[PDB]
Structure 1
Amino acid sequence: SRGEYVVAKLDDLVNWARRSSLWPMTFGLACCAVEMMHMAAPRYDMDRFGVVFRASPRQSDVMIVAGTLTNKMAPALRKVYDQMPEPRYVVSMGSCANGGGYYHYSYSVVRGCDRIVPVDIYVPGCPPTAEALLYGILQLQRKIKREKRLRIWYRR
C-alpha cells in the first residue's frame, strides 16, 4: 500500500542524507592517527566523499578510535562518546583499538575499545593503510544504507 511505500521512500532519503555527510571526530591516540591524516591528504581526499576533516564533538556523526586506549584514557573517551548527538557510530581502527594489539598483555592497556563503547566497524591492520580505512568508512556507509528505522516504527 501507500502507507508503507511513503515510509520506505522517506527512510531511503534520510539514510542517503545521513551517509552522504558523515562528520567524524577522531581520537588520534597513537600512530593510527598518522594513517587517518594520510586519508585526508590529497591522494585519497576523504572530504570528497562528504566526510569532513576534524569535526567538533558536538556536531560529529561518527567516532574513529585510532590508537591504543590506556586505562588512564578510557574515562575520557567514554565521556566524549556520551556527549555526541544521536545517531552516532564508532569505527575501531588498528590492532590496538580492536583488541589491544601489541600491548594486549599489559597492565595499563584496555584490551579493545569495545569494552568501553559499542563498535560498528573494525578496521584491521598495524596500521591499516589509508585506503583500508577508506574501505572501512565506505563499509560504514553501506551499513547505514542498510538500516531501516521508519519501517520498524510503521510495523510496530
Structure 2
Amino acid sequence: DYTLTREIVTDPLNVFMGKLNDMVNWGRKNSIWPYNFGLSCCYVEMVTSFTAVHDVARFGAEVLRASPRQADLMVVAGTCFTKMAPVIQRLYDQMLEPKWVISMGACANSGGMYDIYSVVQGVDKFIPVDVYIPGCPPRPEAYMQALMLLQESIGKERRPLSWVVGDQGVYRANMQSERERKRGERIAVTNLRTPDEI
C-alpha cells in the first residue's frame, strides 16, 4: 500500500527499473545529511548522538550541513515556537528534493508539555513529518532508532529517476505501525527489574 503525492494507490513497480530504484533508494538511505538546526534541548540530545559515545557517523549521517540546500533531512529537534515557525517553514522550503523530516521530542510532535500561548502545537501543523520520536528528550539512541526507521521508509519509496522521463509522482509506503509491530513482544513482558538497584 502506497500514498501518492503529485491518494492511496498500489505499488507502481520492468525488472531493470526496479533495480535502479532500489539502487537509488539504497544510496539515499545510506547517505542522509541532516541540517544543523537547533531549537531546544532535543537538539542537545541529537548532537550527543553525533559524538564518540554513540557515533551516528557509522550510519553515514554525520555530515551536518549548515545550508538547507546541502541537507537531505530536517530534524525538528525542539519546540516550534511561534516566532520560529516561519523560520522553520522557510528553511524547509529552502531544502531540495528529496527531503525528509524527523520530528524529535514531545514539543515537535505535539507541543508536548507546552500547551501555551507562544508555542505551535506540533510541527505537523504546517510541515509534513516522516518519523516521529516520543520523548522529552528522546535519548540519542532513540534518535538513531528513528534514523533507522527513516532508512526503512526510504528503502521502499518510489521516486522518479529523472525529471524528464517517466512518472514524476512521489510514492511513500504505508508501513505497518511500530506499535502494532511490537505489540506482540511488548504485551508478553511479565517481570521487570525492581527500581531499588543500579
TM-score by length of structure 1 reads 0.91
- The residue aligned with 2:71 is 60
Instruction: Measure, in 2, the Cα distance between the counterparts of 1:7 and 1:150.
Output: 10
The total of aligned residue pairs comes to 150
Paired AA for residue 69 in structure 1: C
CA contact (8 A) 1:26 1:66 kept: no
| Corresponding residue for residue 153 of structure 1 | 167
Q: Aligned Cα RMSD in Å?
A: 1.6
Q: Structure 1 residue 69 and structure 2 residue 83: aligned? A: no
Q: List per-residue Cα deviations over 1:61-114 (Å, max 9, x = no partner).
A: 01000111111110011000000010100000000000000102x111000001
Question: Is the 1:62–1:91 contact (alpha carbons within 8 Å) kept by the matching residues of 2?
Answer: yes
Moved over 2 A (4+): 148-154
Task: Tell me which of 99, 103, 125 is aligned to 1:88.
Answer: 99
Gaps of 5+ in 2: 1-13, 169-198
How much has 1:47 moved relative to structure 2? 1.3
Match of 2:42 among 32, 35, 39: 32
More helix per residue: 1
1:144 paired residue number? 154
Tell me which moved more, 12-21 or 53-62. Answer: 53-62
Long gaps (5+) in structure 1: none
SS at 1:64 equivalent: strand
Q: Does 1:17 align with 2:27?
A: yes
Identity, % of aligned positions:
49
- Structure with the bigger RCO (C-alpha within 8 Å, sep 6+) is 1
Query: For residues 63 and 120 of structure 2, what CA distance do their matches in structure 1 show?
Result: 27
Q: How far did residue 150 of structure 1 move?
A: 5.3
CA distance in 1, matches of 2:19, 2:57: 27
